Every structure is written in structure tokens, then in C-alpha cells.
Amino acid sequence: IRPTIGQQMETGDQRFGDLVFRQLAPNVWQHTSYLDMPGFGAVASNGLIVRDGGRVLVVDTAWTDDQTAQILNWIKQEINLPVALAVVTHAHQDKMGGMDALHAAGIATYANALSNQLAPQEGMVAAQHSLTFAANGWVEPATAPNFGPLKVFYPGPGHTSDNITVGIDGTDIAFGGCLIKDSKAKSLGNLGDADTEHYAASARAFGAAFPKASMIVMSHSAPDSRAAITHTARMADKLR
Numbered sequence: 001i002r003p004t005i006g007q008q009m010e011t012g013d014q015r016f017g018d019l020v021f022r023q024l025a026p027n028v029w030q031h032t033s034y035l036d037m038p039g040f041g042a043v044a045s046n047g048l049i050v051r052d053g054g055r056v057l058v059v060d061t062a063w064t065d066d067q068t069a070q071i072l073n074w075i076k077q078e079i080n081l082p083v084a085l086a087v088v089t090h091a092h093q094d095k096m097g098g099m100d101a102l103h104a105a106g107i108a109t110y111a112n113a114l115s116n117q118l119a120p121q122e123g124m125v126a127a128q129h130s131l132t133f134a135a136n137g138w139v140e141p142a143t144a145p146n147f148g149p150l151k152v153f154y155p156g157p158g159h160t161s162d163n164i165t166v167g168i169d170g171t172d173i174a175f176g177g178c179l180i181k182d183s184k185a186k187s188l189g190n191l192g193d194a195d196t197e198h199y200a201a202s203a204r205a206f207g208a209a210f211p212k213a214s215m216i217v218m219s220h221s222a223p224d225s226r227a228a229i230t231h232t233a234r235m236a237d238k239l240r
């Protein structure tokens, strides 16, 4: 319950099985799951759950199929609406480790085409459907049908070459996934698959795609202010 990496539990957190849920807005919750590293401890990872138009939309899986099934069970108990689709934000275990559980539940899955192409090489199951992007970063609309309030944006290579981001129209929330680190972070996390030349511009592009959002949600820290974007970009400036 006390991760080595990731935010600790706080007031407003609901423990459900091995996961933690936090309501961020009337129709938006953050899911948190934990992977125990032998000799190191637990690493927390965050995604989103959105209620729109009688259905639920999921952003990112948990680390494993079992944890992702637990997300679906929490949805059933707390929201009790069908889960129409999930979007996963790049091909690494913290974001895509639970694809099989979504597929077995009948949930349609979407990822950047490049995420689907990298998925097997990264140990992940590909999503069923591929999103593609305009040169300006915005999703090609016919590849993202019935996405409700989700606004999917590819900011450019950064944490990985395939990383995508998601804003929730009608809210104060935008989700940077593993691209954005919090405003007090000391590092950019795992740079092993990263594009250090383009990272800073990609972080700034995320901020400019979602100019209004004041709640920046991210994979390994509690939601932060827009200072997370500026700090991430300035940390990334030093990589060039």
C-alpha cells in the first residue's frame, strides 16, 4: 500500500482489492495498480475511468490481466454501466499489461497504430483497433468512432515514440500518461525507449493541445497543476 515509486494513498482514495480509485470529477476517476519489484518494492501506475452517455471508457490497463479484471469489477460495483472501449497510451506493461482481460470481457480496444506494431516486441498484446494521427497530432476522426468526450492527441516522440495523450472535453482534466512527470520530479523516469531530442517539444505540444486543462493526470504521480508540463519540458530541455 506504500509504493516505492508513485504517489502514496491520501484522503479521497478508495481501496478495492489490490487497487486504489480516486474520483477526480463527477464522471471521471483515476485507477491505480501496483507492481511489486523483487528487491525494490511496489510501483504504482495510474489510468482513467470516464462515464459518458450511459457507458464507461477506460484509459490504460493495469499492470496485469488480473488487476485489469479488478478494475472491471470495481466499475461493475460502483458505476454499473457497460464498458464500451479502452484506449491505451503506449506499448509498455504499465499501460498495456492487461489487454487480454479487456478482450475477454468484450471491450473494444484502441491504441496508436505504432503501439500495436511495437506491442509484440514489447511483450504486449496489441489492441484490436489502430488510431492514426494527423501531422498536427490530432487523431484521425474515423479511426476513433464514438469516443464521447475523449480527445486523443499524439504529441510526438518523448517517453516512447508511440506515446499518446487524452483530454476529457467538458472537464478540467488532461492525461499525459508516462510522458508527463510531476512538477517536483527529479527525473524523467525510464528513458530507455525515449527520444531525448524531441521530448521537450512533445511535452510542450501536449500542453498546447490541451491549453485549458488545470488538472494534469499522469502515470506515476498524483494529479498536478500545469507546472508538471512546464517542469517536464524544462527537464527534457537538458537532454538536448
Ligand SMILES: CC1(C)S[C@H]([C@H](NC(=O)Cc2ccccc2)C(=O)O)N[C@H]1C(=O)O
Pocket: 005, 035, 037, 043, 092, 093, 094, 095, 178, 188, 189, 190, 191, 219, 220
Ligand atoms: C520508470 C517507469 C515507471 S517503468 C514504466 C515502463 N516499464 C514497464 O511498464 C515495465 C515494467 C515491468 C515490471 C516492473 C517495472 C516496469 C517503462 O519502461 O516506461 N514507466 C516508467 C515511466 O513512466 O517513467
Ligand SMILES: [K+]
Pocket: 122, 193
Ligand atoms: K522497449
Ligand SMILES: [Zn+2]
Pocket: 090, 091, 092, 159, 160, 178
Ligand atoms: Zn513506458
Ligand SMILES: [Zn+2]
Pocket: 045, 094, 178, 219, 220
Ligand atoms: Zn510509466
